[PDB]
From a paper:
The group I [name] chaperonin mHsp60 and its co-chaperonin mHsp10 assist the folding of [name]-imported proteins, and correct misfolded polypeptides resulting from [name] stress. Like GroEL, human mHsp60 can also assemble into stacked back-to-back double-heptameric rings capped by a dome-shaped heptameric mHsp10 (GroES in the case of E. coli) co-chaperonin lid to form ATP-driven nanocages for a substrate–protein to fold in confinement. Features shared by all three structures include mHsp60 protomers in an extended conformation along the molecular symmetry axis with clearly defined domains, namely an equatorial ATP-binding domain (residues 1–137, 411–526), an intermediate hinge domain (residues 138–191, 375–411), and an apical domain (residues 192–374). Each mHsp10 protomer adopts the canonical seven-strand β-barrel structure and exposes a flexible loop sequence of twenty residues (mobile loop) that mediates the interaction with helices H and I of the mHsp60 apical domains.
Author numbering:
A (entry chain E): 177 to 352
B (entry chain D), C (entry chain G): 265 to 352
D (entry chain S), E (entry chain T), F (entry chain R), G (entry chain U), H (entry chain O): 3 to 102
The structure:
Amino acid sequence: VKDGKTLNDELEIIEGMKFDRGYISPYFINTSKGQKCEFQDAYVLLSEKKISSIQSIVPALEIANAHRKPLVIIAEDVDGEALSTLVLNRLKVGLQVVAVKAPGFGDNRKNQLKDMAIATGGAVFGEEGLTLNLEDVQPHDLGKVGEVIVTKDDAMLLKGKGDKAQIEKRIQEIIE
Amino acid sequence: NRLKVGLQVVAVKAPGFGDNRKNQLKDMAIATGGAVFGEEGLTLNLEDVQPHDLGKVGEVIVTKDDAMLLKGKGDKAQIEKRIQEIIE
Amino acid sequence: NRLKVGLQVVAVKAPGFGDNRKNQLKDMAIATGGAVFGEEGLTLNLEDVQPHDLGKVGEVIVTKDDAMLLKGKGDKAQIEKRIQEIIE
Amino acid sequence: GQAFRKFLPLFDRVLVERSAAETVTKGGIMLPEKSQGKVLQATVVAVGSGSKGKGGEIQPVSVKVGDKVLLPEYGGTKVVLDDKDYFLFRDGDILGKYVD
Amino acid sequence: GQAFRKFLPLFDRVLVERSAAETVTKGGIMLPEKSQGKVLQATVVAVGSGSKGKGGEIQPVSVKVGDKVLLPEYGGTKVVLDDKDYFLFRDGDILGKYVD
Amino acid sequence: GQAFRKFLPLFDRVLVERSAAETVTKGGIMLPEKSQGKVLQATVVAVGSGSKGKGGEIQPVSVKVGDKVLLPEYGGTKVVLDDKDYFLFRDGDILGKYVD
Amino acid sequence: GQAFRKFLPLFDRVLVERSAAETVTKGGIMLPEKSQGKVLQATVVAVGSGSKGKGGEIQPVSVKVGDKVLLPEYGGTKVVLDDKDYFLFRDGDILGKYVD
Amino acid sequence: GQAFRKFLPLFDRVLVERSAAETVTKGGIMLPEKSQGKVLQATVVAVGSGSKGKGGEIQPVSVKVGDKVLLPEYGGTKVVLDDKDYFLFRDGDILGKYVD
């Protein structure tokens, strides 16, 4: 429960994978609405580390543009230079993309991104143990979800195709 | 160029702020009709400006402590769409 | 050399003071019979030591916090003269 | 040594010109200008007379005009001709020659 | 001086290429990539024309293409051909030649 | 080696003089003096005797008086003759020659 | 210029190997490994071709393989062959030759 | 080039040995060891082969063994033979020769 704001009570159901963090650049605003970015069937990129170099960000956008589908970028943080590339390809021709930082604050974010990847179906990037360098990503290496919406101060993932048996096993892990 | 021959010019800074200042400069450009310079995403370098790339207004008056733009020809449909954006 | 072949050795610092420790080391040397090393007045470098240049005692026992020297063969007339010095 | 639009280097120099800036990627993305450094593949536009530093007779410059070369990184003088900036390097500084 | 895919060094240079990265150990363990530095055993892919710095007649480059050499540590220029990074060293800089 | 108003350089030197300051722009604006640096296109007024550093016989200076050259940036001695400041450079330091 | 297990130095180099570590003393005491530095008496295992830097004809390396020499303190670079670390020095850097 | 107890310098070197430490004064006082520096008058014990750096033929070392010389101050290598420390200098470094 939270401190209400209206005359009456309210029962809200936060469904999907949603979190308090908003889209970084206000150039992805394709909603024609209150600061939203709406994508349908978009790919996902999931890096545990930041995204600084243009060489790092470039192949993901290459794969996305080849498939011609919108892309979400859930990572630690976006370089101003890769951000500049993004805004360049967004203001003009308009490669459907969007940038958001990591939801979890600390150690929690590592588990949260792992769960997000396994929910959407894919693989976290920036790993320590295998480390999954961004230079060699693959069309089955991206997070895939039915629908994504981003506000300036939260975003939601919907229909992540993440191997329901696998997410089941993850659930069993965390429940034990 | 002003004291002698007298190229009619005038210098004024921006309103002064962060995000609101950038939005206000954008709105000023779209109101007068033109394009903001110093952008991040397209960045519109000053070296290559064009006669249709300038802000154009009927009259401008500057005091020591405020200034006024009057007749910005800024694509009234476009400024309308901007208004709809900020009102939503 | 201790964990392997088993040289018999032991390490202990000085008593720990200022000039008093130097005097006590001198007295220890003259008691056991030998020459203090690290001197200022006469250098007595360790590189050239001699079998009659070592302190020799009957028995030595060391704890974690103190040690005891026993039967220092230090020229009893010489230690007597030392005693006379310090008593005067 | 061969010259250019009223310009000629001196005894060691090689005036050349970088290639384009390579804005877009190969496949489908485009890159900004603040990135991508300075294109290190260049073409030689004019050549100095020759290395007079050689004892007695002077030494002719090897890389002939019209060649694609692998530029060095730091050494070089930015000169302007007709508001076209060219780069003047030293003959010993050129890395590779794109022979084909 | 022998060339490569539209490339040729200049007067001293030796374009070569390190060997593989040596991920796994000999016996049964495997190593990551952030370790293991850069493999210092390399093979020469292209060779410069020759040392023109020799008085009068120029000096031919000794290490011929197709040789396994013991690279130096720091000196060297990272060049790219077809997105294949090769290293251009100087003829005096090569340490050893794996003759066999 | 040719001289000037009771002046002559020594063995390597080239006394020259920058061109004008280029106050106004090309089209319609005029620039101040604190900007615009120092005009790097110059004309040679006097020339040294020649490079005696050449073994045995000395080496004559190449760039002859009356030439428009591309000055270097830093190296150079500001000398005064009749309160007319000229710049004395070194023969190896001249970048380009405006041949036409 | 003589070689080793698929290795050969270049033009100046002398691959050699230090002697043992000298653990125990002469008489009756044994020393650790962190002390005792690096044994400066070594034997030459392979020798470079020769000093090509000599004008015209190149200069043969003097110290022949199989010699005990007095190593310099910092000269030479570590190298590995078969996990056996040898040290490659420069011909001018060897201090003394243990002739006998 | 003459040798010592299974030792021989290389091409420029001169192994020598300082004289005594000069403990007592001339008249009646004696000095400690921490003072008195290092006795700069020495005798040459072994001599290098000769200066090969001389063009073509090598250059013989001048100071012959058995001479009293005025040592330099800093340049020199402390070498040990039979636990007898000798100093190896360079032929150009010897200051004076005590001829008599």
